[PDB]
Amino acid sequence: AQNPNCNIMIFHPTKEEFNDFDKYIAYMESQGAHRAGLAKIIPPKEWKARETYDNISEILIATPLQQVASGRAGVFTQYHKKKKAMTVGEYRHLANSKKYQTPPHQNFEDLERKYWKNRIYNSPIYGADISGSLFDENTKQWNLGHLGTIQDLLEKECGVVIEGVNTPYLYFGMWKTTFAWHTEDMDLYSINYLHLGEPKTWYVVPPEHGQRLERLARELFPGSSRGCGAFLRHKVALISPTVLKENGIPFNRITQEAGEFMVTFPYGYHAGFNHGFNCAEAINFATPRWIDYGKMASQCSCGEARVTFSMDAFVRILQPERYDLWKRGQD
Ligand SMILES: O=C(O)CNC(=O)C(=O)O
Ligand SMILES: [Mg+2]
Ligand code: NI
């Protein structure tokens, strides 16, 4: 069995290996990369996502989100308070202001200590989930707006044609912006490219151990757990590495820098934080190996998780027994 300790693997494809996306994902899995839940892919030196980032300031962040925390430093939830619209140039200036800017630090480990000690005492503003792409149309390799669609994969594997579309999303971050513990919708893969700016630190639980994280979360968030049998679908709960180690939960961590891709694998729980002003692009995708995870994915039916149009068909075809209850949650 490849990668039996479920370590995060880092890949350096050549330009020839960067041509065929599906084939390279399958290669990484042949080496055991999925067992970690997360992998890093460093593009060949010949590749670029676009020519420059000098002309992005006029992108609009229609609904910036202020991430307000409640709890204790290592075990907290966050809610998202909507703010007035602002441009990417306005948000960059905000991120660099004395109130929001990254503090002085020694190295990534010192900044990680500072994050976990102090996050809850601040409310950083995140531009999340903005439909769009920063890949040039002429970039032919690993262009996250030109991937094979999940609807086409389901149709290729199972024969059923379904409605829905699959497009990328932009994230504009600042120091302390936070992504809560989650797996993807329908336990899909994700791919995330850090276009510019400061790093993103990730934490991940191996898929084979995901239920250990769920059981800890039910213990740590007992009201939320009574409210919903899949409350981590709400994407609001944070647990620190120190707390995870105290409770024996297997996990790993890694820092993504500008110019690097990360892939999350089906049922790989992940969480993390941004170091300073940055911009990332991410999309969900599927492979043949996903189908069995989609059929078994938990679902939120309490009403909180509310998701895209295109998840309807995935539930309807892969989980027909759960469909009626889940759809009530959506309405
Ligand atoms: O970068 C972020 O805020 C969160 N991204 C992801 O969870 C991802 O790419 O799967
Ligand atoms: Mg612009
Ligand atoms: Ni994710």
Ligand SMILES: [Zn+2]
């Ligand atoms: Zn719920």
